[PDB]
Structure formats: structure tokens, C-alpha cells
Amino acid sequence: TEAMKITLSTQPADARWGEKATYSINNDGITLHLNGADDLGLIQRAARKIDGLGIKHVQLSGEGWDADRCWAFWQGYKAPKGTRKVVWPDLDDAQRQELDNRLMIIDWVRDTINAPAEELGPSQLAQRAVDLISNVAGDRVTYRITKGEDLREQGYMGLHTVGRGSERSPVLLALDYNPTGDKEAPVYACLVGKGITFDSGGYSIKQTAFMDSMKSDMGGAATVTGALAFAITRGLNKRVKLFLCCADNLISGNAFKLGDIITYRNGKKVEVMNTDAEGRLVLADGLIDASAQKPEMIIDAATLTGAAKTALGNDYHALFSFDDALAGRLLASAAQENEPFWRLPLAEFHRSQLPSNFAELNNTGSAAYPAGASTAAGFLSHFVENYQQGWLHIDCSATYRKAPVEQWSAGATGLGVRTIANLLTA
Amino acid sequence: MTEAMKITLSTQPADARWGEKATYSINNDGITLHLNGADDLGLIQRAARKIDGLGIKHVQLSGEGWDADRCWAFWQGYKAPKGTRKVVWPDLDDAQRQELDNRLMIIDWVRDTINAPAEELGPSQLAQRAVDLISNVAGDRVTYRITKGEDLREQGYMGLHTVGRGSERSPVLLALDYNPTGDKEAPVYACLVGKGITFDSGGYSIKQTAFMDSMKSDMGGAATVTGALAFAITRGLNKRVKLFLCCADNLISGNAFKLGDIITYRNGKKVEVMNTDAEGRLVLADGLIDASAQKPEMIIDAATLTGAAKTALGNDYHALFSFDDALAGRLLASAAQENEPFWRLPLAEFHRSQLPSNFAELNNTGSAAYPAGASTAAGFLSHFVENYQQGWLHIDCSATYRKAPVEQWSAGATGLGVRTIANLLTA
Amino acid sequence: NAMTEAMKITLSTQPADARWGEKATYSINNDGITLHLNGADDLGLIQRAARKIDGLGIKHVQLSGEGWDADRCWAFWQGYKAPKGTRKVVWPDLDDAQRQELDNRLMIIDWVRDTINAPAEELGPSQLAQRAVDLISNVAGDRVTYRITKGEDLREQGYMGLHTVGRGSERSPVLLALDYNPTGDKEAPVYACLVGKGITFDSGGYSIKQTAFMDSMKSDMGGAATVTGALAFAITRGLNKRVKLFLCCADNLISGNAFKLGDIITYRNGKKVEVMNTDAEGRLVLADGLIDASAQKPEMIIDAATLTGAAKTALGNDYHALFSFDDALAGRLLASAAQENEPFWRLPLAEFHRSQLPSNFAELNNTGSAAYPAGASTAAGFLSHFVENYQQGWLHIDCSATYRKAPVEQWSAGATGLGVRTIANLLTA
Amino acid sequence: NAMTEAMKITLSTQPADARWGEKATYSINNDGITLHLNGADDLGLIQRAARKIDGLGIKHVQLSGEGWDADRCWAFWQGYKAPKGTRKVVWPDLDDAQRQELDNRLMIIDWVRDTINAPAEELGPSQLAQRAVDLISNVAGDRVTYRITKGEDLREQGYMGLHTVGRGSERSPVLLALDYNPTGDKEAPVYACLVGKGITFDSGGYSIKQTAFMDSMKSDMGGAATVTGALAFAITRGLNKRVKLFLCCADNLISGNAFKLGDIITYRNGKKVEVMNTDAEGRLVLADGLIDASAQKPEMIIDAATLTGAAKTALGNDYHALFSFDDALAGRLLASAAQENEPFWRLPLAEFHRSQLPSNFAELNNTGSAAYPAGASTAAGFLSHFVENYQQGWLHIDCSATYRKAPVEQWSAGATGLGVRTIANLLTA
Ligand SMILES: [Cl-]
Ligand SMILES: [Cl-]
Ligand SMILES: [Cl-]
Ligand SMILES: [Cl-]
Ligand SMILES: [Cl-]
Ligand SMILES: [Cl-]
Ligand SMILES: [Cl-]
Ligand SMILES: [Cl-]
Ligand SMILES: [Cl-]
Ligand SMILES: [Cl-]
Ligand SMILES: [Cl-]
Ligand SMILES: [Cl-]
Ligand SMILES: [Cl-]
Ligand SMILES: [Cl-]
Ligand SMILES: [Mn+2]
Ligand SMILES: [Mn+2]
Ligand SMILES: [Mn+2]
Ligand SMILES: [Mn+2]
Ligand SMILES: [Zn+2]
Ligand SMILES: [Zn+2]
Ligand SMILES: [Zn+2]
Ligand SMILES: [Zn+2]
């Protein structure tokens, strides 16, 4: 397990590799050939190949290494199985401090989402979320976990109806980060995350090829939890509340059925016409709680629809909002944090593109309204009192890679944590 | 309180702008229905549906020409599961209004109970709502017995128990007894048997979402025979009739019945389960055994049993099965008097052996060689009626539910069948 | 092959001994095989016994002893006959009438079975039309005339239904217009018009079928073969009235010329049909035969077609589906089915089935919806748009009892021939 | 069942009486129908009302009273018009400028709707190319010239993309190269090149579609009709610059000559493409048009195509997908879309998309992988390999809002005509 040196050079590789070669190898170690086009993308792609060569011990040596370039290499080098060692170079304290916070919190998002569903049930997601934030938030953090029958008694009909099929009761984490300590302090932001720890699809059962990665259906919850923790390391000094709607969507003699009508505390009635469209049902409860706090902005994140992945692939997160100003601020943050986001449509006509013959709303679209991600966003707007301003919905199409690509190993990428954190501390 | 939209009747056509073919037209006074005498009940129902699609939520049935049937025809079409509708009835006479109010109360109870989501209507809720509807019109002339959960297993109701033990909501057998004379030894005139699957996922033979999304209505047979008995009583039924509802959920759990399982009934029949989604005939079997023990004059079972009957008759007719030509003819004669659609489909001695199993006397499913799903299901049920050749009617309720709205029906339950069975019991 | 020897088959109202079973349909002793009638359904029992005797490898039988009449012999042969192996049957002593009746069924009803069982390669539209002429003109003689319209001529003369369906095949579509006219008088009133679907092979078109459903689609010309045999058998029964036959013959295949979804066919009666499923081609070719049948203004029109799977889902392979608006005429066909021991069952047809095929681009669609799933009723409702006087003197037969994809208790694999006798009885009644 | 007499449609800012409600978009008294405008979106409301008025079965309307204009009349008609039935609309007393704009829309946009709604049998490659010349020649007179290359000539001259997809059909593939040159000068610089996918019927080839997804594939030539209608409308709006039109027209059918999976197509620009899905044929034909477009060295290239279902999954039928590397040009089209009241949404197109179609046997694959499931973005990435300067002056429109398989609030079934005004507006500005 001896270290392999990785150097940076602006000169191309020798003709034995080609002029376009991104990396070359000799006794002095591996050399990454930067060309100024996209050095972070090139380094991350090179790291993916170095892992593929069976090299488990590297050292970033020579000049040119900064936090962003070190992070790029790690993002691509990290893989779910195996042990990897990276000897970092001489960085100033601010550069190393930024890298350490990224390593601690963003890899926590990668590892939590990658974790098996047996290891990470609703209850484990709640307490691991408290631990991550409590470790950086000092004494300025209070929380409450409501599970099982208590969700029924308190009217959380969305989260309870979806989770009750499981032997692992559904959980609501309500975490409060309040820096001033003043219990009257105004709530600046409300983060809401979909924490479905495993999605069988319900009685609308999935096919194996589409269920084999549904341990990552809690990726929205892990991304907003990381965003809060990472924001705190960035100097967040405003009150933020975190709502994680956690549950298993399983099949039992108790699971919810098609045609069942869910009555939310805001009066909205929803006919369930597909148990696999469960993500929007649990988020609706988090959003009602989020609107009640009357925050300056509400941000909900969720691995909600496959329609977002058909529109943007795994290369961008989908951004939905009625607020043009707030959408531009998040895209500006996305650009500073070098994370991919693309705005997909959300207009008033999407709020009526979920017809039902037995209730005000349907949890699915139809053949006539097949914009799955746009209609889902339209459904969530019925649960945000002032939906036309201060609300962002993120369909996390870039959260999980079912197979290794050029720059990513398999599993969670951790994308979206820096963008949301940057918007919170802006 | 707002302004109601007047609905009047005319035997003359609309003006040259609406055209001679127009079934309705709107002037200053309100909406005018243009009758032609071919099928006024059908035309008025189709017109009411279009008046609902216009967004008009408050109507007044105005002027001459209205009676119980024309008012009922309008309501049947106007009513829909969503929204709130006010209908101001015309100045009907006592008898006409009594008959209209009996249909509103009982037949709309059949539409709402079947339209109800499975979460709000389980096996125990169905049995209880059935007792409530009948005692509301019967009073002290009705008594009943519930038998649920482990009690069914102990007492040998293996059909109903095996299908419903998968649900956390225990299966329920309701045995209601309408006895006017009170005499406990009075002869039982009719035995009604109804399939009450409050939700059908198909069991381990799981359905796809597109065919499961309306399975809250798989207890439609139970609701129809219940409404039929209630309606019969409002029509002056004065004979002893027993009602049997086999109510359960067909769900998936670690306790749910599996393919290959052999169910032994109380009459000796052994049935191999080769499709858990063919559960409706498994639960009726227990209902038909109890119905036969009463040795009644007639037995009428109703069930949303197969998609085959819907391929044969669509949602336009109910499927009638029987070995008794005289009795079948009387139900068709009742359907004609009550303006309800019924069509007879084949049931012969050879259907009784078109469910071959390698491991038991009977199979619960058919094969490629015998694809008449509705006829093979009726043939299976004949094995649980002692005198199957006489006094037994089976109804595959293909006209009970409408997955989508059509010309004369909103989405959901129609309530068809209640008047026909009620008329047959009172004839 | 070694010389096969006859196995004597006798009849007995005495049950078999205990070694076999309480109620066994047949027993085998030294002198040969004994069938054990019980008086319940002797014809059904004999046909089922015959099927089993085939499964014993016995290729040569001799019906000996008293008790054998025309029906019991025919009943036996119906079950003994199979599309593989050669079978010799020594008939018993019958009177001239009984033997002539048996010989007519053997010649015509087996022709229906063999022609339907024939591979598509051997029986194209032209072969079906010619073999139908050969059969009828072999019993009618000089009393039969016919015309054959095929290929480009169908398009030129407005037969857009049959041409559009068939132009995908290298084998041109064919329309047979045969005329059985006894008194010779060309002005004689046409008593009946038989119309038949003769799809010699149904790939389903661009709406391509699954192999499990196409592997028997050589039999999609059963209706054509059933009405042809019905006329031939009716003539041997002494049919002395004028009857015209129309066979709409074509292959439904896939080519760079095959018809497409969204195409609108304009028929001669002015009705426009949108094709929203190329596999619902049966009703497209019948519509052209039904126009010609109506034009002749006969006393009754009978049409046969292996049209829908909906009829097989409703009646199985055990009954032919009967569709009509005429209660009196449907009653007579069921009355005929009883005298000929053939299974028919009436399925619904009402004025509302005529509007259960909506289209966004044309008056009629060739397929039903999710809201109107009675495939056999909507198909009959589609055909009613091509019979000028559809409420009187018209019967549609969805031939669900024509073909058996697999052997059963009383039938081998392949065509059954059922329907030939019932139509014949109604024509000669 | 004759044509009825005119029913009057008046506009009003006063709401409906309580019987209808106060949120009712329309009411009906003895005088006729009244539309209740509120000012939120009167064009949307009027169009949705027209759709409901057609649903009542009213075939003859007369827009009367004050308040009507070209946009409000056009809104009413956009919703009233349907492919089925006969409708008549008496227009109100507009001024010449308003009536000239309405007449230009009725002529050119309803042509785009009627041409796309037409059955594949009526509109093959040659018919599409010819109707396209007829429409533009009607408004352009002698300022229009054109060139048609078809059948074996496309193979000879190296249009391997368009020829390989269309050769499976009996109807030969056709490339229309139309030139609108107002100044006459033959050396005039080409301002714009329009390219249109003109697949007159998409069976999907050997990668055959199911009936449910093919029943509307007569509309797979929507791109061609849209850019064609756009050039015609642009001329009525005073277009005074040279614009070339390229329509890659073909049938994607099955035959013994149809193209096969694994087949490598060599384009005139040297690019090799491995076909791994014959249903991704739209991009193979556009590639040939885009090479001709680039060769003209134009200021801008606009291509339109009903290319992928991924755009319909991403935007529904409510917006057209816009792809481009040119932010400024993309910004100019959305500005035109706003002025013309038409829905467009931009989807991602970046350098990494040019390598998201991997093949093991050729530089490019014509299909995407599970790893790159953004079908519309990878399709745009593929087309970019056929535009010389793909980073400047090129727009790709995935026409996800061109066809409605079923009636909705504001549209009947069939083609909408959306995209004609936007492209026309961009060309004229
Ligand atoms: Cl190189
Ligand atoms: Cl690692
Ligand atoms: Cl969802
Ligand atoms: Cl990996
Ligand atoms: Cl009446
Ligand atoms: Cl069943
Ligand atoms: Cl409804
Ligand atoms: Cl043989
Ligand atoms: Cl057909
Ligand atoms: Cl065989
Ligand atoms: Cl209102
Ligand atoms: Cl029109
Ligand atoms: Cl394509
Ligand atoms: Cl339409
Ligand atoms: Mn799901
Ligand atoms: Mn079932
Ligand atoms: Mn077919
Ligand atoms: Mn295609
Ligand atoms: Zn989910
Ligand atoms: Zn059931
Ligand atoms: Zn066919
Ligand atoms: Zn295409």
C-alpha cells in the first residue's frame, strides 16, 4: 500500500499516449495534463480511471493543487467498495478547512444515500441527521422526532398513510437551528426532504431493474441535511428549520391501497391512483409544516420522478419554482459552487393537470398531461400557502448514478449540498 | 341560496340554431329537454350528464310531464362523486315521491358504498353499514350474526378465511335474517349471497396498477344484494329472505394464501389455488353452502367476479348464469319492468369440468383450452349449490362500475341490479 | 408401413365391468372395443370415445353390430379424424338415406376442416376462391355461375376495404361473387346472401401479433370456408332457391405497401372508416361483401367470420356467437342449430353498439375503446353500418367454435367444421 | 342532420348570472352565447370556451358585438376547429389590417393542421414535398424556385441518411430544396435555412412500435409542415431576405429492403453512424438536411422535428423543446414566442452531449444508453455532428407541442399549428 505520486502539468503527454491524453504514467508517478478547457472535470475524470487501474494509495504532489482541484480528484476517486488513501498537499488553512468540511459532510451524503436500506430505516435517518448537524451547530440546535401512531393523531396523514405498510414506523424529524438562541427569532429558511429509506413502489410494485437502487429514495432528505451542516461551516448565522419526512413504501396487509383518499390538515383531499407516486404525498406534510413557520424561503428536495431524469439525464438537478427571482439566485449559487441545475416548467395550469373523479387532487398525471416532473411540482404547490413566492422544489435527478460513468463511481454523487448551502449563506 | 336553473320538458324540437337533432336547448327561461318518445328515460339521463358538464350545480325540475322515472332518470345522470348538486323536485303526488325517495335512499347508498375508498370501508364496516341500511327499513323484523377472523377458521369457512387472512383487517361473514312473521320455523323464500372484497390487489397474483386502481369496487356484489333486500322491503316484501355477505381484503403479507394451497370446504370439495386473483369464487363458495342449507325457493348470488363478463357485455349489461330457464326468464322479466340491463351467458354441465387441477378435484382458474372465464367461474360456483340445476341464479356484475365517465353515467358505481333483484323477490 | 388390421367397435347400453370403472365411456375385450352408452348424450360420448381410441394408436376401425345410424357414425368420425396420420374407417350397413347423408357430411364438412387446416403457403386468396368454386360446382353442376375480381380491379371498382387490407401481400386480394340459380331465370328473386371472411393468413399487419396468437392464423378464413360448405351441404339437402355467395379473400401482411394506422377507407355507401388497429381487418373486408349482399336485396343475409377474441372470451370454443337485430330470424337460426346438434349462443347487439366505435378524424373507427370493451358486440355494431336494412333479415356469426388451437375431449387440433349444418338447415328450412 | 343556423357569440366584461355561477367562462340565453372576460388571459379563456361550444354540438356560430380583433377571433377558431364535422364561422366587421392577419393565419396555420392531421395514405413523401411547393408558390409567386431529389437519385448523390430510412417503402424518399429569393440576385446571401423532418408515417422500422404509440404516427412529419408554414407566414409578414427550405421526407416501413440494426451509414461530411434502433430514424434524415443547410453558409439554421418522446415527458404537449449552443439566438426565439403568444421551453444542450451516443463499431450511435437517458438532449447532440459551426446560428426545435392524441381544454385532437408564428416572427425581425 505504497503512495503513487499524482503531478499537474500544462504540457501534453509524449506521442506514445497521444496529444489529447488527459494523463500519462512513468516511474515519477502519474501526470495529469491540464489544457485550461475544464481542468476540474478533467481531474475528476482522470481520478475515476486511476481507481480503475487498481491504485488504492495516491499522493497529490507538486504545485497547482488547490481545494477545488483536490476535491475534484476525490469526488472521482471515491468508490463505494474498497479502501482508498489520499495524501493531501500543502494547502493554506482556509483551503484545507474548506476541503475537510466537504470531506466530512458531502461524503456523509454519499455514504448515507449509498447505505443499505436494512442499515438505514426511517428512525436511523432521523438520528444520523441530528448527529451530523449537532456536531457543527454547537448548542444552537433543538429537535423533535414524531413516529408511528403519533403522526396519525396529529393529522400527518400523508407520511403515515405511505409508511404504515412497513414494520419500521414512519418518522418526522423537525430540527431547529437557531443561532441567536432567541426563541422569537424569525425563521429565514425551511428545508424539506423526502426520506423514503426504500421504495418497493407499494401495491403499484416496481420491476427489479427499477427497484434495485431504491435505497437512494431518501436522497432528498440527505441532501438538505448536508446543505444545512455545510452552510453552518460556511458561517450560516440565521434561523433554519429542517423537516425530513422519512418512511418505507412497502407491501403488507396494512399498506395503503389505490382509491384511498388522504385528507391533509390544510383541507386538501388526494385520491391515490398509484402507490409509487408516494414521494409527493409525504412531502405535502413537510411543506404544510414549512409554510406554517412563514419563512423567507422554502426549499424542498426529493428523488421524486423518473420524468426529471428523462428530461435532464443524471447530468443536472431539476429546479421548479413560480418565483423567477429566487430561481435565478439558486442558479447563481449553482454556478459559484460548480454544480449542475436546469430549470423545468411550473405554471398555474400544472395545478389542474392531476384530475381525479373522486377527490380535488390525484397523486398521478394522465396520458394527456405526461410532464411527470412539472405535474408533481404542481401537486406540491397545493401544500405551500404562498406558492407563488419564496418556494423552490428540486427534483434530484443528479443525486444517484446506477452505474459508473466518466467522472462518477456508482451510487450517490453528493451534488446539491454546496448550491443550497451557498443560497442559505448568501 | 342563488338562482336555480329551470329544467322543462317538450315533445317539440329546438330552433334551427340548435337543430332538430338537439336533445336539449337553453333559452332565457332555462334548459328545455326535447323528448321524441323513442327512449325518453335514456335521453333525459344523457341530458343531465351534459348539464353537469356545463357546471350548473343547482336545477329545478319545472313544468308538467315529470314523474318518478323521469326524475330518477335525470338524477341517475346528474349525480357524480365530486362536487355538490341541488335538485328541486317537481310537485309529484304521494306515491310517485315515495318511490323516488326510496331509490334516492337505497340505490344512492349502493353507489356511495361502492365508490367509498377501501380505507373507509373494510369487511367490518361493510357488514355494519349493511345491517344499518336494512334495519332502517325492517326494524325488529331483522336479526343478524357476524363471524370474523379466527372464528371463521374454527367453524370451517376456509374459503373466506384463506382469502382474507392476508389483510390486517379480519375477514367477516354477515348472516342477516329478514323474518316478517317472526316465526323462527318460517320457510326461507330467498337466499341472497354477495361477494364483499373491500379491496382486491389480486394477492401474490398481483394486478398491474391500471387494473387495480378501481378495486375498491370489488365488493359491489355485496352492496347490490344488500340494497336489493332493502329496496324489496320498501316495495312490501312479506316473505323470509336471508342475506349472506362474504367480506374480506385480498392483500399480500407473510400470512397471505399461496399458489398450490388446497382449500377444503364443508361440503367435501377440495380446490387448488392456481391464481390468488380468482378469490371472488373462493369466498362465494362459503356463502352458497350456507344459502343451500336453508333449502330456499331461490338463491341469487351477485359478484364483480371476472373481466370476461365485461369482454362479453361491456359495462352495458349484467351477466346472468343459471341451469334454470324458468327462473332466468323471471329475472329478465323483472329487468324489463325495472328498465335495467341483463344478458344471459352460457352455463352447461360441461363447464363444471372445465377447471382441471393435477392435485385436487377443482382448480380456481381456467386454462387456454377453456377461456370462457365467466362461464367457468359460474361452473365452479355450481359445485357449492346442492340443487344447482334448479332455483339458483348467478350474476357477474359487469354493469356495476364505470372506470371512466360515459354518456349517461359519471365515473364509479351505477347502482344497476337493485330494482331487478328487488322486483324478483316481490313478484 | 405394415398392413393395418380393423378393430371392431360395438355399441352397448350395458356398463363396462368393475376393472375399468363405474361410468367408463369405453372398454376393450378380445373381439374389440365396446362403447358404453347411457342415454344422456350418446353422440357426445361416442365422439369423446373416438378421440381416445385415436390416442391408442389404432389407425383402422370397423363400426360393427346393430345401433349405428348416420349421426352416431358421423359423431364417431368427428372425434376420430386428426390432421396427422392416415385413418381407415369401415362403415356399417346403412340404408341409402343414412349413407347418402353421412357421405355428404364426409365430403363437405371435412372439406371445411381440411381447407381451414391447410397451411397459408398452400391456400392463398386465389386458391380459396377456386376451391370454393370447385366444391359448389361439384354438386350444383350447371346451376352455378361465378365472377372473380382480384388485384388492381378491386381498387378501380371501389372495393377499398378488401384492397387496402390485402395490398400488403404478394398474393393479390380476391373477391368471389358466386351465384347458385336453380330455375336459370336471371330475374329470379335472391333468397339468401352468404358473406364470408377469407383472410388466408393474419400477421395482424403493422399492429403485428405475438407468435403465440399468430401460429394458427392460417385459420382466419374459417367464416369463408363455413358459408361455402353451408351452401354446398344445403344443395345436397335439396336447396331449390337462388343463393349468392361472397368471399372477401386476402392476406393481412407487412410490406412497404401495407395499410397504416390513421388511414381512412372510403366505402361505396359513403361511410369513412379510420384504421386505428390493422389487426381489426376482418370487419374491413366484410363491409365490402355486406354492401354487395344488401344491393341484391335478399330475404336474409348470413355472414360468418373468425372475427374477434372477445367472442372466444365470452363463449370459449364451445359456441358460435350469434349477432342480430331480428329476434325472429335469430330464433330460426337457433332452431336450426338444435335440429343439427351444433352449438350457437346469442350475444348482444343494440342501436347503441353502432356508436361505440368513436374516431377523432372519421365517422367510424375499426376498433373499440377501453369504455366499450365488448369487442364482439362493437364489431357487429360496425358491420351493421354496411347492411342497408340492418334491423331486418341479417345475422352475423362470430365463429368462436371454428378452430381448436389444441386437442380437447371430443376434438383434435384444427378446424371442427361446426356451423355448416346449421346455416344449411336455415337455407333449406 | 343538416347545417344549422348561426348562433351569436358576444363578448362581455360583466359576469354570468347565479344559475351558471360567477366563475362561468360562458352563458347561454335566447339571444345566444356570451363569453365572460375577466382580463386574466382572455385569449386562453376564449379558446377554451370555443372548445366547449363545439362540445354542445353547435356547428354554425357568428361572432357579433364590439371587442373582437384578429387575436380574439383566431383564439375562438383555434379551439372551435376540429378534424371531424362541418363548421361555419361568420366573422365580425374587423378593419383591413386585422382581417388581413386573420386570413393569413386561416390559410397558412390551418394548412399546417390539415396537412399533419391527413392520413399517411393521402400524404406520402412526394405529396408532402409538392403541397409544400404549392403553399409557398401561392404567396411567393415567381420569387420561389426548388429542386426535388427522390428514390435511387438520393443514394447516387450520397443522401445515405434520408435514402436508408425511406428505401423500405414503396413510396420513394424525397428531399425538397426550396429557395425563396426576393431580390432575384442569385449571389444574394442566404439569411436562414429551415430543415424539417418529413416522415409521412413512422412504423418504427424493424424496431416496430406498439399500436398504442403508432396510431398517430401520420404526424411524424410535423416538423416539415411547421417550417414550411413558417416560411409562408413569414412572407405574408413582409419577409424580404433569402430563406432556403429543406424537407427530408420518407416512410419508415418494414420490407425485404428496409434498413437493419448494425447498419453503418456514411454521411457526405465523413461521419459514420451505427443504427442500433431503426425507430430513431428522424435524426438520420435531418442529418442530410443539416449538411445542406450548413453548406449554404447561412446566418441562422432552424430545424424542427417530432423527434423524441423525451421532450413530451419533459414538457408535455404544453411547450415546444428548444435546443441550442447559441444563448443569444435562443434568447431571440423565446422573445418571438412571447410576441406571438406561443409556448417554448429551453432544454439542455452542451459539449458533453456530443459524446453521449457511444457505439462499438462506429464514431456515432443513433440511440442513447441507460447511462444517458436524456433522449431529447442526446438527439440534439447527435444533430450537432452535422452542423459545420454548431456553436453559432443553430436552433433545434423538438416539436413536443405539435400534436394532441386526444382533445384537451383548449385543443381538439390532432395538430395545433403551434410554432408557425414564432419561427416566422424570428425570420422577419
Ligand atoms: Cl491523442
Ligand atoms: Cl474510498
Ligand atoms: Cl411522487
Ligand atoms: Cl463503482
Ligand atoms: Cl318516460
Ligand atoms: Cl373469481
Ligand atoms: Cl365523473
Ligand atoms: Cl384422418
Ligand atoms: Cl375484425
Ligand atoms: Cl391433433
Ligand atoms: Cl361558477
Ligand atoms: Cl372545422
Ligand atoms: Cl430520431
Ligand atoms: Cl377532437
Ligand atoms: Mn415511488
Ligand atoms: Mn380478484
Ligand atoms: Mn386480425
Ligand atoms: Mn421513430
Ligand atoms: Zn419515491
Ligand atoms: Zn375479486
Ligand atoms: Zn382476422
Ligand atoms: Zn420519427
Query: Would you call C316 and B343 a contact, using CB atoms and an 8 Å cutoff?
Result: no
Kindly list the distances between the CA atom of residue A337 and the CA atoms of A97, A342, B361, in Å, as whole numbers in the listed order: 16, 14, 71
Rounded-to-integer distance, Cα A293 and Cα D159, Å:
64
Q: Where are the domains of chain D?
A: 1-94, 95-429
Strand partners, A299: A191, A392
Question: Maximum CA pair distance of chain B?
Answer: 73
Cα separation, D37 vs D46, in Å, equals 8
Q: What is the DSSP string of D209-243?
A: PPHHHHTTGGGTTHHHHHHHHHHHHHHHTT--SEE
**Do the beta carbons of residue C317 and residue C197 sit within 8 Å?**
no
Give the span between the Cα atoms of C150 and C127, in whole angstroms.
12
DSSP letter at C15?
A: P
Four-CA torsion B75, B81, B84, B88, nearest 10 degrees: 10
CA–CA separation, B426 and B237 (whole Å):
5
C-alpha cell at C313: 372470451
- Closest-CA residue of chain D to A210: D370
DSSP letters along C232-264, please? HHHHHTT--SEEEEEEEEEEE--SSSS--TT-E
B185 contact partners, CB below 8 Å, separation of at least 6: none
A223-247: string of b/e by CB count within 10 Å (b at 16+)?
Answer: bbbbbbbbbbbeebebbbbbbbbbb
Interface test with B, best of D3, D4, D22 (most B CBs within 10 A): D4
Cα-Cα-Cα-Cα torsion B117, B119, B123, B126, nearest 10 degrees, comes to -50
Residue position matching grid coordinates 437512494: A216
Residue A195: count other Cβ atoms within 10 Å of its Cβ. 33
CB neighbourhood size of C77 (10 A) = 21
Integer CA distances (angstroms), C278 to A99, C398, D167, D212, D251, in order? 64, 18, 22, 12, 17
Sheet hosting strand B30-34, strand order edge to edge: B24-26, B30-34, B5-10, B58-61, B86-88
List CB contacts (< 8 A) between D306 and chain C: none
Range B274-296 burial, b when 16+ CB lie within 10 A, else e: bebbbbbbbbbbbbbbbbbebeb
CB D251 within 8 A of CB D125: yes
| CA–CA gap between residue B344 and residue B367 (Å, rounded) | 22
Helix, strand, coil content of chain B in percent (nearest 5): 40, 20, 40
A260: left (phi over 0), alpha (psi -120 to 50) or beta: beta
Q: How many Å apart are CA B196 and CA A23, to the nearest integer? A: 70
d(CA C331, CA C143): 30
Closest CA to A275 of A166, A148, A152, A149: A166
Residues comprising chain D, all counted: 429
- CA–CA separation, D137 and D285 (whole Å): 25
Q: Write the single-letter amino acid at D329.
A: L
Alpha-carbon separation of residue A349 from A353, B135, C314, D72 (angstroms): 7, 48, 44, 20
What crossing angle do the helices spanning B220-234 and B418-426 adopt, rounded to 10°?
50
Report how far residue B3's alpha carbon sits from residue D269's, in angstroms, rounded to the nearest whole number: 73
Q: Strands of C320-323's sheet, edge to edge? A: C144-150, C174-180, C242-252, C190-202, C300-305, C394-398, C320-323, C344-346
What is the rounded radius of gyration, in angstroms, for the C-alpha atoms of chain C?
22
Q: Rounded CA gap, A159 and A153, in Å?
A: 12
A35 at D interface, C-beta within 8 A: no
Dist. CA B398 → ligand 7 center (Å): 19
For residue C121, give how far its alpha carbon lies from the nearest alpha carbon of chain D (Å): 18
B392-415 exposure pattern, b = at least 16 Cβ within 10 A, e = fewer? bbbbbbbbbbbbebbebbbbbbbb
Residues less than 5 Å from ion ligand 15, measured at CB: A 199, 276
Rounded CA separation D27/D34 (Å): 5
Q: What angle do CA D318, D122, C202 make, to 5 degrees?
A: 95
DSSP C380-400: HHHHGGG-TTTTSSEEEEE-T
DSSP D129: H
The CA–CA distances, whole Å, from C131 to A158, C123, C424, D192 equal 70, 9, 19, 64
Closest CA to B323 of B397, B383, B395, B382: B382
CB of B17 within 8 Å of any CB in chain D?
Answer: yes
Query: Hey, how many other C-beta atoms are within 10 angstroms of the C-beta on C14?
Result: 9
User: Given D312, D374, D406, which is nearest A312 (Cβ)?
Assistant: D374
Find the ligand nearest to A24 CA. Answer: 1
Candidates D59, D194, A306; CA nearest to B19 is D59
Positions of E strands within B325-368:
342-344, 362-363
Chains in contact with B, where contact means 3 or more Cβ–Cβ distances below 8 Å, are: A, C, D
The DSSP 8-state label assigned to residue B235 in this structure reads T
What's the CA gap between B220 and B197, in Å, rounded?
8
**What does DSSP say about strands D7-12 and D60-63: parallel, antiparallel, or unpaired?**
parallel
Q: How far apart are the first and last CA of chain C?
A: 47
D206-213 contacts: CB < 8 A, separation 24 or more?
A: D206/D254, D206/D258, D206/D259, D206/D260, D206/D261, D206/D278, D207/D261, D207/D277, D207/D278, D207/D279, D207/D280, D208/C206, D208/C208, D208/D254, D209/D279, D211/C206, D211/C207, D211/C261, D211/C276, D211/C277, D211/C278, D211/C279, D213/D309
How far is Cα B38 from Cα A242, in angstroms, rounded to an integer? Answer: 66
CA A414 to chain centre: 7
What's the gap in Å between A114 CA and the centre of ligand 4?
Answer: 11
**Residue B323, SS3 per DSSP:** coil
The 10 Å CB-count burial string (b at 16+, else e) for C151-177 is beebeeeebbbbbbbbbbbebbbbbbb
B303 — alpha (psi -120 to 50), left (phi > 0) or beta? Answer: beta
Which DSSP string do the residues of B207-223 spell out, in sequence order?
PPHHHHTTGGGTTHHHH
Which residue type sits at C347? L
Residue D277 distance to chain B (closest CA, Å) = 28
Interface residue D407 vs chain B (CB under 8 A): no
CA-based nearest residue in chain C for residue B211: C370
Tally of CB atoms within 10 A around B65: 15
The C-alpha atoms of residue C152 and residue B292 are separated, in whole angstroms, by 67
Rounded to 10 degrees, the C-alpha dihedral B128/B133/B137/B140 comes to: 0
Q: Which positions 301-340 of B are in contact with C (Cβ < 8 Å)?
A: 308, 310-317
- Strand pairing report for A317-320 and A391-395: antiparallel
Contact list, C279 vs chain D (CB under 8 Å): 211
Secondary structure letter of residue A14 according to DSSP: P
Contacts (Cβ under 8 Å, ≥6 apart) of B388: B323, B382
- Could you tell me which of C386, C412, C381, C385 has the C-alpha nearest to residue C398? C381
Cell of B65: 310531464
- As a whole number of angstroms, the distance between CA C384 and CA C325 comes to 9
Q: What SS3 class is residue B277?
A: coil
d(CA C380, CA C370): 17
Question: Looking at chain D, which residue has its C-alpha nearest residue B1?
Answer: D18
Give the whole-angstrom CA distance, residue D219 versus residue B282: 50
Experimental approach was X-ray
Contacts of residue D415, defined as CB under 8 A and 6 or more positions apart, other chains included, come to D112, D113, D114, D115, D116, D117, D219, D222, D225, D402, D403, D404
- Residue C56, judged by CB atoms within 10 A of its CB (0-12, 13-18, 19+), counts as exposed
- B117 and A260 within 8 Å at the Cβ level: the answer is yes
Grid coordinates belonging to B145: 350474526
Sequence-distant (6+) residues with CB within 8 A of D30 are: B27, B28
- Distance of CA A14 from the midpoint of ligand 1 (Å): 10
- What is the sign, positive or negative, of the torsion defined by CA atoms of D123, D127, D129, D135? negative
C-beta separation of A344 from A318 below 8 A:
yes
Nearest to D274 by CA among D374, D206, D361, D176: D361
For residue A71, give the DSSP letter: H
D interface test, pick of A20, A210, A310 with most D CB neighbours within 10 Å = A310
Q: Which of C59, C131, C155, C209 is catalytic?
A: C209
Task: Please tell me which residue of chain C has the smallest CA distance to B314.
Answer: C374
Q: Do chains D and B touch (3 or more CB pairs under 8 A)?
A: yes
Phi/psi of residue A18, each to 5°? 115, 160
Chains A and D are touching, with contact defined as 3 or more CB–CB pairs separated by less than 8 Å: yes
Task: Give the relative orientation of helices A417-424 and A93-114 as an angle to the nearest 10 degrees.
Answer: 120
In angstroms, the CA B14 to CA B4 distance is: 22
CA D229 to chain CA centroid, nearest Å: 8
**Residue A202 near residue A70 (C-beta atoms within 8 A):** no
Beta pairing partners, C199: C250
Say if CB B131 and CB B226 are below 8 A apart: no
CA distances from A121 to A199, A247, B391 (A): 12, 8, 58
CB neighbours of residue A265 within 10 Å: 16
Amino acid at residue number C267: Y
